[PDB]
């Protein structure tokens, strides 16, 4: 789905738009897969931009 359409980012939507270690995001979710923001789509994980997009120029 065009990431500007979507309400949470992939790995790479996520990378791309959160330029953040692509090694994190995996570690995150993996680690906390209870997280409020990742949502795991049968096998595909992805990132919550509302909860997220807040904190990037907080990083």
Do not use: H, V
């Amino acid at each position: 789905i065009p990431i500007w359409e979507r309400y949470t980012l992939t790995i790479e939507e996520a990378s791309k738009y959160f330029r953040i270690g692509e090694n994190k995001l995996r570690r995150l979710a993996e680690e906390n897969k209870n997280a409020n923001w990742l949502i795991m789509n049968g096998n595909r994980i992805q990132i919550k931009r509302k909860q997220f997009e807040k904190i990037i120029d907080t990083l």
